[PDB]
């Protein structure tokens, strides 16, 4: 059976481009403004929106996203506001997945969160601190409620672990990172036809274009947050530049 | 000798079944280095030459065994029970943490790693790690929150005299939380030459088991000593619980003694009803935190609640997963002790026995006094005195009005 | 064989030691001396003390081969006798446990003692709390005003602390007030003297309580190294830690014994505490020994970066051993001590007392002298937690 | 073979009174002023002058004397200044003994100090931190240079030690201190006929009379220094009151 995000990538590869995948955290700079920001990403040409659930103890995150998530939490942001942002994105004709650390999902109830994300129009979950080894409950919830499940791979991932991570993913596999990124994408292609999204601190049209030569999706987050902090117009302009970068034809 | 594995987790780090407590709730970006360390430790923990090296440093450098001292002058305050203090306060550096960093620094060297990193709150684990690194000629980098470094000028200075670099983290809240964040990032970038010295019996597998293994010696010694002095196994063995290394270390040797009660005492701060506490078992619930599934203090969304205690070392919103298992299994009871109960016990131990304990350790003493009343006259209670209180003299002096204003 | 005569004199007619005290103190001095004579050979006393040494103070202390120092010591083998690991952080615990037990056997309910920067006072307060003795520590007012945390320790332990404003307002005048208190309160008070000096019986008694250091060290070095050491060394203030480690080796004729004393800015500068190197014989605090004194016999102000080695006198048993040719006493400067302090931190992760760092510095020089493979046992008399701030200023880490 | 201070105590007991024994430290507030004060003690009726040798560590002294000896040392007082003071007192017709802690004597040389004190006219030494147990060299030099030797006894002294201390003393024995002084004196009396001097921090006329009732000598130190600090005329006046006290 087909992934939820499969048709977006099928459609992108038919237009000789990569999908633009845009991250923003719920509640930055507050809940309404973040929703207006995520809506604007859909209007400016983001194929997929990663809706970030701010978390008190993020391990993976650089300063830009960390300062933003801390601000979001100071503002009183709730996990259910992420579900509201997903509804809004779906209403605007966008395609939304949720990116979250695992404890909020555990606290919610894993089956419950998958049910409520699906009901909100969410298409999947990105799990940066959930590896397949701990993902039994999530895989059952993912199958039950038809959600894509995007695990991460890294340059240091062993052959055995790259294979298991790719085999357990649905929709795309997130290749998080000079020549490290194409080599990693190459290693994924050797064992699977699954779409690979690449994150690489993308800040410009030229960087998006480089990544779009070898990857199925170009993931961007920090630079969107930096843009949003300036204002909504700046975010629109950057997204347009990035959308032109993902197109090769 | 390589000691038995009956209480060990599965190969995934789980206690109590393949999806129970512990595990590895970490990013795939950390898994290569976590697996390298895991395979290294699996080899070395059954290597007689590794255990001989560690034993030799434990004996001659650190001063093991630590003695067991019957604090007869506490008896009247513990319902005429008998309180025996396992004196980790006399170890080199002044706590049980030296047991851990000796094991891990030896392991780092066995792995060919030239550099060790770690993080610290008030400074104890930072000083211990820098101590072991100076010993073994390893490059040492300690990450420490900007708010902690400005507040701990002499601990930063200790670390630097020991040859370590101290990196004051000025981003975010500038606390322990932010230092952990920088340490984990350093590890990933420098994995080829760098070993991360975990501070307690928590984190992803293999750290809860490894740290506990390096602390097992406390309980091993204590089980022999108490039978020597009391003529029998104790009615109870107790310890303070932060992440859980000292507690699990003293408990382990008593696990299959079904007549021995095991009690861990956690920091209740201003009181468990006030929301200013670190009473993980008493007020927290199951969740993933810092790499393991265990108990934590968390709000209705799963966000970490900020904890408070008068002691730095117990001021931790989580707890090691092996303790979670032992709680679920009914083997260990976990109980709250307030700032005030701890400080009263601190003062009492000073006046009655001439031992200035760590405020952390004073939570266990306070606990033990209460358990003495429960169990009554002649009951035999072993207490892990996890550290000396030199670092706490200023806090205690302010508490008791000894500095004026 | 090494003991003094009944009057407290070492070496016959040279007359080291004795009792150069007022008659007002003699009733109580004879009383302690009689009690010490009875208890030193009583099995109950020695058992009680051995039990406290093991279970309470953490004896034996280990002997550690500091292999990372070796390259800095001519490739000699430096073994550190780890008194830094005792309860309270130094050798002083050995002395106070013994004297405190004696005080309780004598029926005394109150113990007094003097202290400089606070180490002996903390140790004495510790033993008194353990044994339920009332404790009053005398400390010079210059010292109390800059050792606020050590005063607080003493108070936490239940001791009273008296800031002394008479004379210099430092160690020697706290000592003077403690002798005055003992006179008035001798019926119920025991004076816990803090080094191997003073009138008989203290040099001998303090030494006997510190002998355990050397007895352990002799056994441990033979165990680890396979032979007696080439040298045993120690820092020398009043002389308690040094005499404790040396005593067990006095009759081993191939074992060199070296005491290192504080040279401050240097012996030729006048700012030192080099009692043997630059002092001369005299009576001071009850003992005929070497003394830093001017040419009328007035006590000279001493100086060291180390407060513990900053005592103008030295114990009479050391004066005897110097005259016999058995022990050599040598100066170590502030600079040498501090370089050794840093090196020990960096190489072994051991933060030594600045006092003890004088000994380590002396051992590094002695290693270069004796050569590759020589075995040097060093008494590491205390931990350096108390000296971190001083060392941090020295190295510009603040 | 009789003591050097013997005839002074004879003359006092013949005149129905105790000896007035006055202490001052050399060099307080400077050397010349100290000598003029000691000279004024002779002119005001002191029977015996105790010339104090300032010492850096005087354990038996109270704060009045300690602060004055401290001040004297700050001013550069030397042991030789004490010998010059003895000489001036002797030429003025007065009776001087020296009170000193023992280390200055050791540094001088015991025999040499005894020689030079004798050559200055000095009649004895009072030795607050020399017990008979350590006094071998002192006994020899005492006999050789014909000086009296005033050891101290105390309320706490055992019967054995009191007897030994009195036995080793010549001239007088210094009883240093409720009813403790007269008992101490009574215990010396029951074993020897040697004169006894009593210090009780005497401040006034009435206090001196109270002590001359049982003691052969009334010793005064602290009050003399306090009077001198106020001025030489106050010292003369106070010394006149204390001399009128001992004749009662």
- Nearest by CB to residue B158, choosing from C153, C156, C351, is C351
Task: Given the residues B66, B88, B97, B353, select the one marked as catalytic.
Answer: B97
Residues B233 and B362 in one domain: yes
Instruction: Enumerate the β-bridge partners of residue B239.
Output: B264
- On whether the CB atoms of residues C309 and C237 are closer than 8 A, the answer is yes
The three-state secondary structure class of B6 is coil
What is the rounded CA–CA span in Å between residue C264 and residue A238? Answer: 69
3-state SS track over B69-86: EECHHHHHHHCCCEEEEE
What is the rounded CA–CA span in Å between residue A46 and residue A23? Answer: 10
What is the DSSP-derived secondary structure letter of residue C112?
E
**Crossing angle for the helix pair D232-246 and D222-230, to the nearest 10 degrees:** 150
Return the closest-CA partner of residue A127 out of A118, A116, A115, A114: A114
Identify whether B303 is part of a domain: yes
Residues B78 and B119 in one domain: no
**Crossing angle for the helix pair D222-230 and D63-74, to the nearest 10 degrees:** 60
What is the rounded CA–CA span in Å between residue A30 and residue A147? Answer: 27
Residue C31 CA, chain-centre distance (Å), reads: 24
Identify whether C1 is part of a domain: no
Residues B298 and B278 in one domain: yes
Nearest chain A residue to B18, by CA: A134
Return the closest-CA partner of residue B349 out of B89, B63, B59, B22: B89
Identify the residue among C51, C62, C64, C156 best suited for mutation to test binding to B, counting B beta carbons within 10 A and taking the highest. C156
- On whether the CB atoms of residues D199 and D176 are closer than 8 A, the answer is yes
What is the DSSP-derived secondary structure letter of residue B194?
E
Residues B386 and B302 in one domain: yes
Decide the pairing of beta strands C286-291 and C16-20. antiparallel
> Which residues contact residue A158 at a Cβ distance below 8 angstroms, ignoring those fewer than 6 apart?
B31, B32, B35
CA-based end-to-end distance of chain A: 30
Nearest chain B residue to A157, by CA: B32
Q: Which chains touch D (3 or more CB pairs under 8 A)?
A: C
- On whether the CB atoms of residues B287 and B305 are closer than 8 A, the answer is no
A/B interface, count of CB pairs below 8 Å = 98
What is the rounded CA–CA span in Å between residue C19 and residue C3? Answer: 15
Q: What is the signed CA dihedral for D164, D168, D170, D174, rounded to 10 degrees? A: -50
What is the rounded CA–CA span in Å between residue A121 and residue A116? Answer: 9
Residues B210 and B225 in one domain: no
What is the rounded CA–CA span in Å between residue D119 and residue B231? Answer: 78
Q: How many CB atoms lie within 10 A of CB B216?
A: 18
Residues B67 and B131 in one domain: no
Cα of C188 to nearest chain B Cα, Å: 21
- On whether the CB atoms of residues B241 and B319 are closer than 8 A, the answer is yes
> Which residues contact residue B253 at a Cβ distance below 8 angstroms, ignoring those fewer than 6 apart?
B216, B219, B220, B222, B223
Nearest chain C residue to B391, by CA: C385
What is the DSSP-derived secondary structure letter of residue A3?
-
- Nearest by CB to residue A59, choosing from B27, B172, B298, is B27
Q: D touches A (3+ CB pairs < 8 Å)?
A: no
The three-state secondary structure class of C332 is strand
3-state SS track over C130-174: HHCCEEEEEEEHHHHHHCHHHHHHHHHCCCEEEEECCCCCCHHHH
Return the closest-CA partner of residue C175 out of C157, C160, C159, C162: C162
Identify whether C168 is part of a domain: yes
D247 touches chain C (CB under 8 A): no
Q: Among residues C147, C181, C210, which one ends one of the domains?
A: C210
CA-based end-to-end distance of chain D: 31
Peptide bond preceding B206: is omega within 30 degrees of 0, i.e. cis?
yes
Contacts made by residues C369-372, CB under 8 angstroms, sequence distance 24+:
C369/C74, C370/C74, C370/C76, C370/C230, C370/C231, C371/C74, C371/C75, C371/C76, C372/C74, C372/C75, C372/C76
**Residue linked to tokens 């830690």:** C241
3-state SS track over A92-134: CCCCEEEECCHHHHHHHCHHHHHHHHHHCCCCEEECCCCCHHH
Could you tell me where the DSSP H helices lie in chain C? 26-39, 43-55, 92-106, 119-131, 141-146, 148-156, 171-185, 202-225, 240-246, 275-278, 316-323, 334-348, 354-370, 388-394
CA atoms within 13 A on the CB side of B171: 17
Containing A197, the helix (H) or strand (E) segment is strand A196-199
Residue A66 CA, chain-centre distance (Å), reads: 16
Return the closest-CA partner of residue C356 out of C237, C230, C183: C237
Asked if B171 and A153 come within 8 Å (Cβ–Cβ), the reply is: no
Q: What is the signed CA dihedral for D205, D211, D213, D214, rounded to 10 degrees? A: -170
What is the rounded CA–CA span in Å between residue D228 and residue D36? Answer: 11
Instruction: Enumerate the β-bridge partners of residue B383.
Output: B85, B238
Q: How many CB atoms lie within 10 A of CB B297?
A: 25
| DSSP-derived secondary structure for B268-309 | EETBTTTTB---HHHH-EEEEETEEEEEE-B-TTSPBPPP--
Identify whether C3 is part of a domain: no
Asked if B350 and C389 come within 8 Å (Cβ–Cβ), the reply is: no
- Give the number of domains in chain C: 2
- On whether the CB atoms of residues C281 and C14 are closer than 8 A, the answer is no
Identify whether B169 is part of a domain: yes
Return the closest-CA partner of residue B150 out of B174, B118, B177: B174
What is the rounded CA–CA span in Å between residue B363 and residue B353? Answer: 16
Identify whether C4 is part of a domain: no
What is the rounded CA–CA span in Å between residue B123 and residue B155? Answer: 6
Residue D72 — φ and ψ, nearest 5°?
A: -60, -45
What is the rounded CA–CA span in Å between residue A92 and residue A49? Answer: 12
The method of structure determination was: X-ray
Catalytic site includes residue B43: no
The three-state secondary structure class of B26 is coil
What is the rounded CA–CA span in Å between residue B380 and residue B225? Answer: 13
Residues B334 and B381 in one domain: yes
- On whether the CB atoms of residues A215 and A198 are closer than 8 A, the answer is yes
Q: Among residues C156, C188, C210, which one ends one of the domains?
A: C210
- On whether the CB atoms of residues C138 and C112 are closer than 8 A, the answer is yes
Return the closest-CA partner of residue D122 out of D207, D241, D38: D38
**Crossing angle for the helix pair C119-131 and C148-156, to the nearest 10 degrees:** 10
Residues B293 and B331 in one domain: yes
Q: How many CB atoms lie within 10 A of CB D109?
A: 13
| DSSP-derived secondary structure for C179-227 | HHHHHHHTTTEEE---SS-SSTTHHHHHHHHHHHHHHHHHHHHHHHHSS
Residues B177 and B302 in one domain: no
Residue B244 backbone class (left: φ over 0; alpha: ψ -120 to 50; beta: rest)? left
- Nearest by CB to residue A157, choosing from B12, B28, B303, is B28
Asked if A154 and B35 come within 8 Å (Cβ–Cβ), the reply is: no
CA distances C103 to C32, C93, C191, C192, D53, Å, are: 9, 15, 9, 9, 36
CA distances D32 to D25, D89, D121, D237, Å, are: 12, 12, 19, 20
Domain carrying residue C27: 10-57+93-210
The three-state secondary structure class of C279 is coil
**Crossing angle for the helix pair B31-44 and A159-168, to the nearest 10 degrees:** 130
**Per-residue b or e along B3-29, where b marks 16 or more CB atoms closer than 10 Å to that residue's CB:** eeeebebeeebbbbeeebbbbbbbbbb
- On whether the CB atoms of residues B295 and B280 are closer than 8 A, the answer is yes
What is the DSSP-derived secondary structure letter of residue C62?
P
The first and second tokens of residue C367, run together, are 């290693």
- Nearest by CB to residue B134, choosing from C56, C132, C345, is C345
The first and second tokens of residue C335, run together, are 């600079």
- On whether the CB atoms of residues A152 and A181 are closer than 8 A, the answer is no
**Crossing angle for the helix pair C26-39 and C92-106, to the nearest 10 degrees:** 100
- On whether the CB atoms of residues B89 and B67 are closer than 8 A, the answer is no
CA-based end-to-end distance of chain B: 55
C/D interface, count of CB pairs below 8 Å = 94
What is the rounded CA–CA span in Å between residue D34 and residue D232? Answer: 10
Residues B254 and B330 in one domain: yes
Domains of chain A by start residue, with CATH: 1-249 (3.20.20.70)
CA-based end-to-end distance of chain C: 52
What is the rounded CA–CA span in Å between residue A21 and residue A217? Answer: 6
**Residue linked to tokens 């005055």:** C180
Decide the pairing of beta strands A173-176 and A96-99. unpaired
Chain A segment 95-154 residues within 8 A of B by beta carbon are 102-108, 128-131, 133-134, 136-137, 151-154
**Residue linked to tokens 């008989």:** C200
What is the side-by-side order of every strand in the sheet holding B194-196? B165-169, B139-145, B115-120, B194-196
CA atoms within 13 A on the CB side of C268: 0
Q: Where are the beta strands (DSSP E) in B16-105?
A: 21-25, 68-70, 82-87
What is the DSSP-derived secondary structure letter of residue A179?
-
Class of residue A203 by CB neighbours under 10 A (exposed 0-12, middle 13-18, buried 19+): middle
The first and second tokens of residue B50, run together, are 């590794």
What is the rounded CA–CA span in Å between residue D221 and residue D169? Answer: 21
What is the rounded CA–CA span in Å between residue B200 and residue B197? Answer: 9
Q: Among residues B215, B247, B281, which one ends one of the domains?
A: B215
What is the rounded CA–CA span in Å between residue B172 and residue A67? Answer: 7
Residue B307 backbone class (left: φ over 0; alpha: ψ -120 to 50; beta: rest)? beta
The first and second tokens of residue B336, run together, are 């709250």
What is the DSSP-derived secondary structure letter of residue C293?
B
Peptide bond preceding B65: is omega within 30 degrees of 0, i.e. cis?
yes
Q: How many CB atoms lie within 10 A of CB B243?
A: 28
Residue D177 CA, chain-centre distance (Å), reads: 14
Decide the pairing of beta strands C189-191 and A124-126. unpaired
Q: What is the signed CA dihedral for A70, A74, A80, A82, rounded to 10 degrees? A: -40
What is the rounded CA–CA span in Å between residue B311 and residue B267? Answer: 8
Nearest chain C residue to D108, by CA: C296
Q: What is the signed CA dihedral for B152, B157, B158, B160, rounded to 10 degrees? A: 130
- On whether the CB atoms of residues D99 and D147 are closer than 8 A, the answer is no
The three-state secondary structure class of B123 is coil
Identify whether B2 is part of a domain: no
CA distances B358 to A47, B319, B366, Å, are: 57, 19, 12
What is the rounded CA–CA span in Å between residue A120 and residue A138? Answer: 18
Resolution (A): 2.3
Class of residue C52 by CB neighbours under 10 A (exposed 0-12, middle 13-18, buried 19+): buried
Residue A160 CA, chain-centre distance (Å), reads: 24
The first and second tokens of residue C264, run together, are 């401050």
Cα of A75 to nearest chain B Cα, Å: 14
What is the rounded CA–CA span in Å between residue C184 and residue D109? Answer: 33
Integer Rg of chain C from CA: 20
D161 touches chain C (CB under 8 A): yes
**Per-residue b or e along B384-394, where b marks 16 or more CB atoms closer than 10 Å to that residue's CB:** bbbbbbbbbbe
What is the rounded CA–CA span in Å between residue D39 and residue D31? Answer: 12
Question: Vertex B175, ends B172 and B181: CA angle to 5°?
Answer: 70
- On whether the CB atoms of residues B68 and B226 are closer than 8 A, the answer is yes
What is the DSSP-derived secondary structure letter of residue C326?
S
Question: Vertex B384, ends B380 and B390: CA angle to 5°?
Answer: 130
| DSSP-derived secondary structure for D146-180 | T-EEE-EE-TT--HHHHHHHHHH-BS-EEEE---H
Question: Vertex D237, ends D232 and D243: CA angle to 5°?
Answer: 120
Return the closest-CA partner of residue B191 out of B59, B353, B329, B30: B30
What is the DSSP-derived secondary structure letter of residue B318?
B
Identify whether B398 is part of a domain: yes
Residues B279 and B324 in one domain: yes
Q: What is the CATH number of the domain that holds C241?
A: 3.40.50.1100
The three-state secondary structure class of A13 is helix
Residues B72 and B127 in one domain: no
Catalytic site includes residue C393: no
Containing A77, the helix (H) or strand (E) segment is none
What is the rounded CA–CA span in Å between residue C280 and residue C290? Answer: 5
């Amino acid at each position: 059976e087909a992934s939820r995000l499969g048709p977006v990538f099928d459609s992108c590869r038919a237009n000789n481009r990569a999908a633009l995948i845009g991250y923003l955290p719920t509640g930055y700079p507050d809940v309404p403004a973040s929703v207006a920001a995520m809506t604007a990403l859909v209007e400016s040409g983001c194929d997929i929106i990663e809706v970030g659930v701010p978390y008190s103890d993020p391990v993976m995150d650089g300063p830009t996203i960390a300062r933003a998530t801390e601000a979001a939490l100071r503002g009183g942001v709730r996990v259910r506001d992420t579900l509201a942002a997903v509804e809004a994105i779906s209403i605007a004709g966008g395609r939304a997945v949720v990116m979250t650390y695992w404890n909020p999902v555990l606290r919610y109830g894993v089956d419950a969160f998958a049910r409520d994300l699906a009901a909100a129009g969410g298409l999947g979950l990105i799990t940066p601190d959930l590896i397949p080894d701990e993902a039994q409950q999530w895989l059952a919830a993912s199958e039950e409620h038809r959600l894509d499940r995007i695990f991460l791979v890294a340059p240091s991932s062993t052959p055995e672990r790259l294979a298991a991570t790719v085999e357990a993913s649905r929709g795309f596999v997130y290749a998080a990172s000079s020549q490290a990124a194409p080599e990693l994408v190459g290693r994924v292609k050797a064992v699977s036809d699954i779409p690979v999204g690449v994150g690489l601190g993308v800040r410009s049209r030229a960087q998006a274009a480089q990544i779009a030569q070898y990857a199925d999706g170009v993931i961007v987050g920090s630079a969107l947050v930096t843009a949003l902090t300036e204002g909504l117009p700046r975010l629109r302009a950057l997204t347009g530049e990035l959308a032109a970068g993902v197109r090769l034809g | 000798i390589a000691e038995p594995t009956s209480h060990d987790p599965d190969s995934g780090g789980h206690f109590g079944g393949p999806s129970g407590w512990g595990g590895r709730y970490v990013p795939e970006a950390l898994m290569a280095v976590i697996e390298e360390v895991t395979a290294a430790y699996q080899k070395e923990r059954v290597s007689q030459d590794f255990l001989d090296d560690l034993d030799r440093l434990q004996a001659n450098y650190a001063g093991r065994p630590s003695p067991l001292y019957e604090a007869t002058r506490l008896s009247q305050h513990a319902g005429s029970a008998r309180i025996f203090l396992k004196r980790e306060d006399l170890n080199h550096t002044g706590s049980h943490k030296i047991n851990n960093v000796l094991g891990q620094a030896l392991l780092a060297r066995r792995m060919g790693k030239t550099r060790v990193i770690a993080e610290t709150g008030a400074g104890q684990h930072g000083v211990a790690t820098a101590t072991a690194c100076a010993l073994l000629g390893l490059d040492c980098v300690i990450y420490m929150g900007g708010i902690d470094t400005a507040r701990q000028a002499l601990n930063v200075a200790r670390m630097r005299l020991l040859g370590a670099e101290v990196v004051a983290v000025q981003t975010g809240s500038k606390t322990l939380k932010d230092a952990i964040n920088e340490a984990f990032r350093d590890w990933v970038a420098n994995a080829d030459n760098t070993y991360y010295c975990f501070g307690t019996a928590a984190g992803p597998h293999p750290f809860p088991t490894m740290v506990r293994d390096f602390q097992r010696i406390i309980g091993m010694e204590a089980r022999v000593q108490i039978q020597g002095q009391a003529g029998r196994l104790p009615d109870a063995v107790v310890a303070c619980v932060g992440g859980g290394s000292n507690a699990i270390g003293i408990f382990h040797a008593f696990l299959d003694d079904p007549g021995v009660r095991l009690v861990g005492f956690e920091a209740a701060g201003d009181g468990v009803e006030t929301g200013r506490h670190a009473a993980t078992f008493t007020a927290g619930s199951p969740g993933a935190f810092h790499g393991s599934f265990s108990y934590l203090l968390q709000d209705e969304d799963g966000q970490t609640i900020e904890s408070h205690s008068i002691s730095a070392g117990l001021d931790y919103p989580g707890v090691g997963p092996e303790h979670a298992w032992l709680k679920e299994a009914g083997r260990v009871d976990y109980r709250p002790i307030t700032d005030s109960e701890a400080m009263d016990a601190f003062g009492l131990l000073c006046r009655m026995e001439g031992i200035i304990p760590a405020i952390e350790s004073a939570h266990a003493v306070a606990g033990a006094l209460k358990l003495g009343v429960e169990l009554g006259r002649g009951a035999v209670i072993v207490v892990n005195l996890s550290g000396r209180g030199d670092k706490d003299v200023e806090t205690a002096a302010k508490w008791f009005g000894l500095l004026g204003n």
